[PDB]
Amino acid sequence: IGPGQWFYATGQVIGDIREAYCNINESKWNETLQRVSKKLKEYFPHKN
Amino acid sequence: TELRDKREKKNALFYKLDIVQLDGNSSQYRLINCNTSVITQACPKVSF
Amino acid sequence: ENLWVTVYYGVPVWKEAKTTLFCASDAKAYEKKVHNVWATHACVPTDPNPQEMVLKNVTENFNMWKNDMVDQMHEDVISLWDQSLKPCVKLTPLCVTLNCTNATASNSSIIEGMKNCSFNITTELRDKREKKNALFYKLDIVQLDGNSSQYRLINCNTSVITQACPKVSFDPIPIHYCAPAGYAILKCNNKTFTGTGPCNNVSTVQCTHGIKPVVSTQLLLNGSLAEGEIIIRSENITNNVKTIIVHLNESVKIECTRPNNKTRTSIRIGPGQWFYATGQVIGDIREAYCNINESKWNETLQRVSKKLKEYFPHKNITFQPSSGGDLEITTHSFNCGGEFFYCNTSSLFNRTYMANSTDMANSTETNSTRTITIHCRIKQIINMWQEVGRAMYAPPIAGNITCISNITGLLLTRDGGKNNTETFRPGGGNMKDNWRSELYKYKVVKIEPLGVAPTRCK
Amino acid sequence: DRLFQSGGGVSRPGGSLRVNCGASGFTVRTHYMYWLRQSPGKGLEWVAFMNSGGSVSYVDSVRGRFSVSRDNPANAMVLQMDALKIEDTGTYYCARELREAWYGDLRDYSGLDVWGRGTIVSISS
Amino acid sequence: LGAAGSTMGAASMTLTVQARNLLSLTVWGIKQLQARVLAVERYLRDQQLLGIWGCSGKLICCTNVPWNSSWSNRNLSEIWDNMTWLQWDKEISNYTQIIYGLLEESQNQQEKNEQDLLALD
Amino acid sequence: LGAAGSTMGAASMTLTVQARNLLSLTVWGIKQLQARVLAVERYLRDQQLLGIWGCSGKLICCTNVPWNSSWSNRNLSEIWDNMTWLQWDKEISNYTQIIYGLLEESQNQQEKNEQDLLALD
Amino acid sequence: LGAAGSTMGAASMTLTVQARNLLSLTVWGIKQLQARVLAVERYLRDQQLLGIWGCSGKLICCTNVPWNSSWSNRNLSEIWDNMTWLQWDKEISNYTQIIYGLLEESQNQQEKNEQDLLALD
Ligand SMILES: *[C@@H]1O[C@H](CO)[C@@H](O[C@@H]2O[C@H](CO)[C@@H](O[C@@H]3O[C@H](CO[C@H]4O[C@H](CO)[C@@H](O)[C@H](O)[C@@H]4O)[C@@H](O)[C@H](O[C@H]4O[C@H](CO)[C@@H](O)[C@H](O)[C@@H]4O)[C@@H]3O)[C@H](O)[C@H]2NC(C)=O)[C@H](O)[C@H]1NC(C)=O
Ligand SMILES: *[C@@H]1O[C@H](CO)[C@@H](O[C@@H]2O[C@H](CO)[C@@H](O[C@@H]3O[C@H](CO)[C@@H](O)[C@H](O[C@H]4O[C@H](CO)[C@@H](O)[C@H](O)[C@@H]4O)[C@@H]3O)[C@H](O)[C@H]2NC(C)=O)[C@H](O)[C@H]1NC(C)=O
Ligand SMILES: *[C@@H]1O[C@H](CO)[C@@H](O[C@@H]2O[C@H](CO)[C@@H](O[C@@H]3O[C@H](CO)[C@@H](O)[C@H](O)[C@@H]3O)[C@H](O)[C@H]2NC(C)=O)[C@H](O)[C@H]1NC(C)=O
Ligand SMILES: *[C@@H]1O[C@H](CO)[C@@H](O[C@@H]2O[C@H](CO)[C@@H](O[C@@H]3O[C@H](CO)[C@@H](O)[C@H](O)[C@@H]3O)[C@H](O)[C@H]2NC(C)=O)[C@H](O)[C@H]1NC(C)=O
Ligand SMILES: *[C@@H]1O[C@H](CO)[C@@H](O[C@@H]2O[C@H](CO)[C@@H](O[C@@H]3O[C@H](CO)[C@@H](O)[C@H](O)[C@@H]3O)[C@H](O)[C@H]2NC(C)=O)[C@H](O)[C@H]1NC(C)=O
Ligand SMILES: *[C@@H]1O[C@H](CO)[C@@H](O[C@@H]2O[C@H](CO)[C@@H](O[C@@H]3O[C@H](CO)[C@@H](O)[C@H](O)[C@@H]3O)[C@H](O)[C@H]2NC(C)=O)[C@H](O)[C@H]1NC(C)=O
Ligand SMILES: *[C@@H]1O[C@H](CO)[C@@H](O[C@@H]2O[C@H](CO)[C@@H](O[C@@H]3O[C@H](CO)[C@@H](O)[C@H](O)[C@@H]3O)[C@H](O)[C@H]2NC(C)=O)[C@H](O)[C@H]1NC(C)=O
Ligand SMILES: *[C@@H]1O[C@H](CO)[C@@H](O[C@@H]2O[C@H](CO)[C@@H](O)[C@H](O)[C@H]2NC(C)=O)[C@H](O)[C@H]1NC(C)=O
Ligand SMILES: *[C@@H]1O[C@H](CO)[C@@H](O[C@@H]2O[C@H](CO)[C@@H](O)[C@H](O)[C@H]2NC(C)=O)[C@H](O)[C@H]1NC(C)=O
Ligand SMILES: *[C@@H]1O[C@H](CO)[C@@H](O[C@@H]2O[C@H](CO)[C@@H](O)[C@H](O)[C@H]2NC(C)=O)[C@H](O)[C@H]1NC(C)=O
Ligand SMILES: *[C@@H]1O[C@H](CO)[C@@H](O[C@@H]2O[C@H](CO)[C@@H](O)[C@H](O)[C@H]2NC(C)=O)[C@H](O)[C@H]1NC(C)=O
Ligand SMILES: *[C@@H]1O[C@H](CO)[C@@H](O[C@@H]2O[C@H](CO)[C@@H](O)[C@H](O)[C@H]2NC(C)=O)[C@H](O)[C@H]1NC(C)=O
Ligand SMILES: *[C@@H]1O[C@H](CO)[C@@H](O[C@@H]2O[C@H](CO)[C@@H](O)[C@H](O)[C@H]2NC(C)=O)[C@H](O)[C@H]1NC(C)=O
Ligand SMILES: *[C@@H]1O[C@H](CO)[C@@H](O)[C@H](O)[C@H]1NC(C)=O
Ligand SMILES: *[C@@H]1O[C@H](CO)[C@@H](O)[C@H](O)[C@H]1NC(C)=O
Ligand SMILES: *[C@@H]1O[C@H](CO)[C@@H](O)[C@H](O)[C@H]1NC(C)=O
Ligand SMILES: *[C@@H]1O[C@H](CO)[C@@H](O)[C@H](O)[C@H]1NC(C)=O
Ligand SMILES: *[C@@H]1O[C@H](CO)[C@@H](O)[C@H](O)[C@H]1NC(C)=O
Ligand SMILES: *[C@@H]1O[C@H](CO)[C@@H](O)[C@H](O)[C@H]1NC(C)=O
Ligand SMILES: *[C@@H]1O[C@H](CO)[C@@H](O)[C@H](O)[C@H]1NC(C)=O
Ligand SMILES: *[C@@H]1O[C@H](CO)[C@@H](O)[C@H](O)[C@H]1NC(C)=O
Ligand SMILES: *[C@@H]1O[C@H](CO)[C@@H](O)[C@H](O)[C@H]1NC(C)=O
Ligand SMILES: *[C@@H]1O[C@H](CO)[C@@H](O)[C@H](O)[C@H]1NC(C)=O
C-alpha cells in the first residue's frame, strides 16, 4: 500500500475443499441436556 | 502504489459473505461496510 | 547489665536502588512555545543550587559500567527527538519518480547529483499539478530500479520521511538531574577514578551539573576535561569486544566549515505545508573541511599511547583508520549549523609508537603552520540512531557554515592477533557510551531512616 | 587485508570437522562474511552468511548441522560441521564482502573482494 | 546527610536533619506525580510504624523490649564507640523483621490493653 | 479482615491489623494516581478527625464525653457480648454525626482552653 | 474563615475551624491531581514543622523559648487587645525565619537529648 503498509489476503487455495466443521460426543451432550432439563423443570415446576 | 502515479491491477480472494454486490451492474462488487464505516487491518503483534 | 531495645528515626543510612531521576534546566527559557523543548525543558524548575556536602570518613563503590541512570538519559533523548517531529509536515506526497540530470552552476563538474532534480507536485487545488525542480545532495538519491534517468528518494519504499520544523531545530541544552525525596545523588570526587572500586572521597548533591545531549560518532566534543592526566576507562581491557574510553585532560580546538553557500527555495505542498530545498548554489565550489593543530594532536596521541600501554603492559602499539560498515561507524558525524556532516578521519590514526628508539623534538613541528586538513561530506535525510523506520529530513541552510568545537575524548576499539602487538582504531556507535562518559561520577541511593539498637533505659 | 584458513581434513560420514578463518587488516566482527564450498570440478555454492550484526543465515542443506561462531580473541570465524555427509566433500572458502548501506538503507555494492585460499574437506568411508 | 561516616553515638546527635529532608507536559507530568506520591507513601509508612510502635512524636524513644544477645554479642561501648550505622544495619538486617514484629504488638499493644485495664472498673 | 463476624469485645483485641492495611500508559496511569491520592485523602481525613478529637497516636482512647441513653438502651454486657460491629454501626449511624460534633469541640477544645488557662498567669 | 477581622485573643478561640478546611479528561485531569498533591504537601509540611517543634497534636502549645524584645516592643495587652493576626504577621515576617530556626532545635532537640539523658544510666 505504501511506506510500511500492506494488505494481507488469500492467495492460492490448497488443495482439497472441505467445509470447516465441529465434532461433539453425542452421549455426553445427551446426558448433559437431560440433566439440564431435569434441573430446569424446577423453576417451571410443571408440564414438559 | 507506491509512487502515487503507477497504479496496478491486482487480485485477491475474499470470503463471499464479506462481499456485497454493487448498487448497479452485477459484475461490480463492493466491500461489505465501506460506504458506512472505517475498516482497519489487525496488526500481527496485536493478535489478542 | 540492662540492654533494652531502642529505635531511631532519621538515621543517615542508605542503600543502592533503582528509581526515576528528574530533569532540571537553566534559567533562560527557550521562549518558542514548542512542546518538546519549551514545555519539556523551559517549563522545568530552573537553577538548582549544587550546595555539595563533602563526607568525612566515608567509602563507597562506584560502578560506571553498570548503573541505572544512563538508560534514562538514552530514554529522554529518544523521547525528545520523537516529540520534535510530531507537529510538522510529512513528505509522503514527495517520494515520487524523480527525473534528475547532473549539472550545476557556472561550470557543471561538481553536482554531485543535486542539480535540477525534477518532479510532479499536485498543489494546491489537487487538480493543477506542476513540474518543479530542486537540488538534493547526491548521497541522498538512489537510482530507480529501472532506467538510469529515473531516481528515487533514498528511503521511501521503506519508511516515512518527515521534515524538521524551524522552531524545533534542537541545539544542545545542558540538562541537570535531581532525585526525588528519600533519594540522594553521591559523587566519588576522585581525580584518578577509573570507574570502579571503592572511592575514599564521597560527597552528595541535590543536583548534578548540566550534561548536554550531544550525539556523536567516535570523538567526544563539547565535553568536560579530565582534572589531572589523560584517563583510560574500559570494562575489561583484555576483552577484545569492550569499547575503550579515552578522557583527555586538555581540549583540542577543531575548526570545520562548509565554505560555499546555497540559496534556499520552497515548494508549496498545501495549506500550511512547504518543502524546503536547495535552489541556486553560490558561487564557487569547495568541499567542506576541518582543520586541526598537528602538534597538539601529536603530543596528545603520544600521551594516549603512553597511558594505553599500561593496560597492555608489553609490546608496541598501532593505530589504524576505520575498517568498514556504514560510514556512521567509520566517519566523524556531527550537526554544526543544523546541517549534518561526515568527515573521513582516516588520516588521523595512521601513526605508530616504539620503545625508546628516537625522540627528535627539536622540530617544534613548524611555526604554527602545519594545519592538518580533512575532507567532509554532508547530508539531509537522517535515520537517527534513536530509531528505525522514521527518517528525518533536514532543510538546507542558506549561506555558508562555520563551526568551532573542543575535542575532549575518544572512543576506541581494539584487535588481537597480528604479530605480537596491539592494534586499535576508532569505534563508537553506542549512544550510551557517550553519556556513560560523563555520568560515571554519579550514583543514586535511597534513604531508609528507621533503625534499631540496644541502649540502657527502660 | 588478508584472510587465512586452517582445519578441514578427513572424516567419515557422521563425524565432525572444523575450519578456522582469521583476518588481518580488519576485524571479522564488523564486516559481512561468507562461507562457500566448491565440490571438485563443479561450481561454487553458498553455505553460510554472517552480517556485521553477527546474526547468521544458513542454507537449508546444512541447517542444524553447520554452525558458525565468532572467535574475537583470535579475530576469526569458525565453521563447526557435525553430522557430515558425502555431499559435504569439497574445498571450502571464507570471504569478505564490501557493501554500502547508508543509515541502514543500501545504495552501493562491490561484491566479494577478499578470498581465503580454501581448505580441503573429504568425507569418505 | 553528614553524619554517616561518624560513629553511632556521634550520628545520634543530629537526626532532625534527615527528618526535614525525608519529605518535600506528558513526559515528566506523570513522573512528578509518581515521585511525590511515592514520597508520601514512604513517609506515611514510617509514621504508621511509629503509630503502632508508639513513639509517634519522638525521634528517640525507649521502651520495654529486652535485647537478644543472639542478634549480636558486641558490647555497647564497642557498638556506640567506633562503628557507623551503615555497618550496624548490615549486621542487624536479618533479625530486623523479627524485631519489628515483636516491637509492634508485644510492646505497645500489650501496653494499651493493660493500660485501659488499669483504668478499667 | 478477620474479626468482623466476631463479637465487639473480641474484635477489639486486633485493631493494628486494619491499621497496617488501611494505607499503602494512558489507560491505568490516571487511574493509579486517582486511587493513591484517594487513599491518602481518606487516611488523612481520619488522622485529622483524631487531631481534633485528640487521641492522635492511640488506637484506643477514653475521654470525658457522657453517653446518651437515647442513642441506645442496650446493656454494655449485651453490646460487647454477642454483637458484631457491623450491627452496632447500623444502629448508631443516625446519631454518629451528632456524636462527632460533640466529641470534636466540647471534649477536646474545651480541654485545650481550660488547660492553657490552668497554666495561665 | 470568620475571625480574621477580629482581635488575636478573639480569633484564638476558633482554630479547629481552619483545621477542618485546611485539607480535603485531559484538561482538568492533570490539574486535579496537581492540586490535591499540593494540598497534601503543604499539610504534611506543617505537620513536619510540628513534629520537629513537638506540639504534634495540640493546636496550642507553650514551650521554653524566651521572646525577644527586639522583634517587637509592644505590650501583650496591646497585641492581644486590638490587633488582627493579619497585621501581626506583617510585623513579625522578618524574624519569622529566625524564630523557626531557634524553635526547631534549641527547644525540642535539646529537650530530647537532655530527656533521654535523664532516663539514661
Ligand atoms: C558546542 O557545540 C555547539 C554545536 O556546534 C557549538 O555551538 C555553536 O556556537 C556558535 C558560536 O557561539 C553558534 O553560532 C552562532 O549562531 C547564532 C545563530 O544561531 C541561531 O540561529 C540559527 C539559524 O540562523 C539556528 O540554527 C540556531 O539553532 C540558533 O537558533 C548567531 O546569531 C551567532 O552570531 C552571533 O555572534 C557573532 C559572534 O560570534 C556575532 O558576530 C553575530 O552578530 C551574532 O551576535 C553565531 O553565529 C552556533 O549556532 C552554535 N551551534 C549550536 C548547535 O549550538 C559550540 O561552538 C560547541 N563548543 C565547543 C567547545 O565544542
Ligand atoms: C576529595 O576530592 C574532592 C574533589 O573532587 C575534594 O573536594 C574539593 O576540595 C577542595 C579542597 O578542599 C576544594 O577546593 C576549594 O573549595 C572551596 C569550597 O569547597 C572552593 O570555594 C574553592 O574555590 C576557589 O579556590 C580554587 C583553588 O583552590 C580556585 O581554583 C577556584 O577558582 C576558587 O577561587 C576551592 O575549590 C573543592 O572546592 C572541593 N570540591 C568541590 C566540588 O567543592 C576533597 O577535598 C577531596 N578530599 C578528600 C579527603 O576526600
Ligand atoms: C554528469 O556526470 C558525468 C559523470 O561524472 C560527467 O562526465 C564524466 O567526466 C568524467 C571525468 O573525466 C569521466 O570519467 C572518465 O572520463 C575519461 C575521459 O574523460 C574516460 O576515459 C574514463 O573512462 C572515465 O569515464 C566520465 O566518463 C564522464 N561521463 C560522461 C557520461 O561523460 C558529466 O560531465 C556530468 N554532466 C553532464 C553529463 O551534463
Ligand atoms: C583515587 O583513585 C585512585 C585509583 O583510581 C586511588 O589509588 C588507590 O590508592 C590505594 C591506596 O593508596 C591503592 O591501594 C594500594 O595498593 C597497593 C598495590 O598497588 C598496595 O601495595 C597498598 O598497600 C594499597 O593497598 C590502590 O591500589 C589505588 N588504586 C589503584 C587502581 O591502584 C586513590 O587512593 C584515590 N584517591 C585519591 C587520589 O585521593
Ligand atoms: C595533561 O596530562 C599530560 C600527561 O601527564 C601532561 O603532560 C606533561 O607534559 C610535560 C611537558 O612535556 C611533561 O614534562 C616532562 O616530564 C618528563 C617526566 O615526566 C621530564 O623528563 C621532561 O624533562 C619534562 O619535564 C610532564 O612530565 C607531563 N606529565 C607527566 C605526568 O609526565 C599535561 O601537562 C597535562 N595537561 C593538561 C592541560 O592537563
Ligand atoms: C576479561 O577478559 C579476559 C580475556 O577476554 C577474560 O579472561 C578469559 O576468560 C575466558 C572466559 O572465562 C577464558 O576462556 C576459557 O578458556 C579456558 C582455557 O582452558 C577454557 O577451558 C574455557 O572453556 C573458556 O573458554 C579465557 O581463557 C580467559 N583468558 C585469560 C587470559 O584470562 C576474563 O575472564 C574477563 N573478565 C571478566 C570479569 O569478564
Ligand atoms: C608528529 O608531528 C610531526 C611534525 O612534522 C609529523 O611527523 C613528520 O612527518 C613528515 C611526513 O611523514 C616528515 O617529513 C618526512 O621526513 C622524513 C625524515 O624524517 C623524510 O625522509 C621524508 O621525505 C619527509 O620529508 C617529518 O620529518 C616528520 N617530522 C617529525 C618531527 O616527526 C607528524 O605529523 C607527527 N608524527 C606522527 C607519527 O604522526
Ligand atoms: C528528464 O528531463 C530531460 C530534460 O528535458 C528529458 O530529456 C528530454 O527527453 C526528450 C525525449 O527523448 C527529448 O525529446 C528532449 O530533447 C530531451 N531534452 C533534454 C534537454 O535532454 C528526459 O526525457 C526526462 N526524463 C524523463 C521524462 O523520464
Ligand atoms: C509529470 O508527469 C507527466 C505525465 O506523466 C510527465 O509528462 C510525460 O512525459 C513523458 C516522457 O517525457 C511523455 O511521453 C508524455 O507525453 C508526457 N505527458 C504529459 C501529459 O506531459 C512529466 O514528465 C512529469 N514531470 C515531472 C517533473 O515529474
Ligand atoms: C599548536 O600547537 C603548538 C605546539 O603544540 C602551540 O604552540 C604553543 O605556543 C605557545 C606560545 O609560545 C607556548 O606557550 C606553548 O607552550 C606552545 N605549545 C606547546 C604544546 O608547546 C600552538 O599554540 C598551537 N596552536 C594553537 C592555535 O593553539
Ligand atoms: C573520622 O575518623 C576519625 C578517626 O576515626 C574521627 O576522629 C575523632 O575526632 C573527634 C573530634 O576530632 C574526637 O572527639 C574523637 O575522639 C576522634 N576519634 C578517633 C577514633 O580518632 C573523626 O571524628 C571522624 N569524622 C567523622 C565526621 O566522624
Ligand atoms: C461464632 O459464634 C459462636 C457462638 O455465638 C462463638 O462461640 C464462642 O466461642 C468462644 C471460644 O470458643 C467462647 O469463649 C465463647 O463463650 C463462645 N460464645 C458463645 C455465645 O457460644 C464464636 O466465638 C464465634 N466465632 C467468632 C470468630 O466470633
Ligand atoms: C468589630 O470591631 C468592634 C470595635 O473594634 C468590636 O467591638 C467589640 O465587641 C465585643 C462584643 O460586642 C465587645 O466585647 C468588645 O469590647 C468590643 N470592642 C471594642 C473595641 O469595641 C467587634 O468585636 C469587632 N467584630 C469582630 C467580629 O471582631
Ligand atoms: C497445509 O500446509 C502445509 C504446509 O504448506 C502442507 O504440508 C499441508 O499439506 C497443507 N494442508 C492442506 C489440507 O492443504
Ligand atoms: C408432555 O409430554 C407429552 C408426551 O410425553 C406431550 O405429548 C405433551 O404435549 C406434553 N405436554 C405438556 C403440557 O408439556
Ligand atoms: C452494465 O450496465 C448496462 C446499462 O444498462 C446494462 O445494459 C448491462 O447489462 C450491465 N452489465 C452487467 C453485467 O450488469
Ligand atoms: C528506458 O527503458 C528502455 C526499455 O528497455 C531502454 O531501452 C532504454 O535504454 C531506457 N533508457 C534509459 C535512459 O535507461
Ligand atoms: C616494536 O617496534 C619495532 C620498531 O621499534 C617494530 O619493528 C616491531 O614490529 C614492534 N614489535 C612489537 C612486538 O610490537
Ligand atoms: C554567502 O552569502 C553571503 C550573503 O548572501 C554573501 O555575502 C557571501 O559572499 C556568500 N559566500 C559564499 C562563499 O558564497
Ligand atoms: C561565509 O564566508 C565569509 C567569507 O569567506 C565569512 O566572512 C563568513 O564568516 C562565512 N559565514 C559562515 C556562516 O560560514
Ligand atoms: C565491653 O566491650 C569490651 C570490648 O572492647 C569487652 O572486653 C567487655 O567485656 C565488654 N563488656 C563490659 C565492659 O561490661
Ligand atoms: C543474614 O542472612 C543472609 C542471607 O542468608 C546471610 O548472607 C547473612 O550472612 C546473614 N547474617 C546473619 C548475621 O545472620
Ligand atoms: C502595656 O501597654 C501599655 C500601652 O497601652 C504601656 O503603657 C505599658 O507600659 C505596658 N506594660 C505594662 C502595663 O506592664
Author numbering:
A (entry chain E): 309, 312 to 322, 322A, 323 to 355, 357 to 358
B (entry chain E): 163 to 210
C (entry chain C): 32 to 132, 136 to 143, 148 to 150, 152, 154 to 309, 312 to 322, 322A, 323 to 355, ...
D (entry chain I): 2 to 82, 82A, 82B, 82C, 83 to 100, 100A, 100B, 100C, ...
E (entry chain D), F (entry chain F), G (entry chain B): 523 to 546, 568 to 664
From the manuscript:
We further determined the epitope of M1214_N1 by deriving a 4.86-Å-resolution cryogenic electron microscopy (cryo-EM) structure of the antigen-binding fragment (Fab) of M1214_N1 in complex with the CH505 SOSIP trimer. The structure revealed an elongated epitope of M1214_N1, extending from V2 to V5 and centered on the ridge of the CD4-binding loop (Kwong et al., 1998, Wyatt et al., 1998), thus named “V2V5 corridor” epitope. The M1214_N1 epitope partially overlapped with the CD4bs at the CD4-binding loop and V5, consistent with its ability to compete with CD4-Ig and CD4bs-directed bNAbs to bind to CH505 SOSIP. However, M1214_N1 approached the CD4-binding loop from the opposite (the other) side of that contacted by CD4 and CD4bs-directed bNAbs. M1214_N1 interacted with gp120 primarily through its heavy chain, which contributed almost 80% of the buried surface area of the antibody Fab. A long 18 amino acid (aa) CDR H3 loop (by Kabat definition) reached to a valley below the V1V2 β barrel (Gorman et al., 2016, Pan et al., 2015), contacting a short turn (the integrin binding site kink) (Pan et al., 2015) between the V1V2 C and C’ strands. The heavy chain of M1214_N1 also contacted V5 via CDR H2. The light chain of M1214_N1 contributed minor interactions with gp120, contacting residue Q183 on the C’ strand of V1V2 and the glycans at N197 and N386. The contacts of M1214_N1 with the N197 glycan could restrict the movement of the V3 loop from the neighboring protomer. Together with its contacts on the V1V2 β barrel, the binding of M1214_N1 stabilized the “closed” conformation of the prefusion Env trimer, as evidenced by reduced binding of mAbs that preferentially recognize the “open” Env conformation, such as anti-V3 crown mAbs 447-52D (Gorny et al., 1992) and AD358_b7 (Jia et al., 2016), as well as mAb 17b (Kwong et al., 1998) that recognizes the co-receptor-binding site (CoRbs).
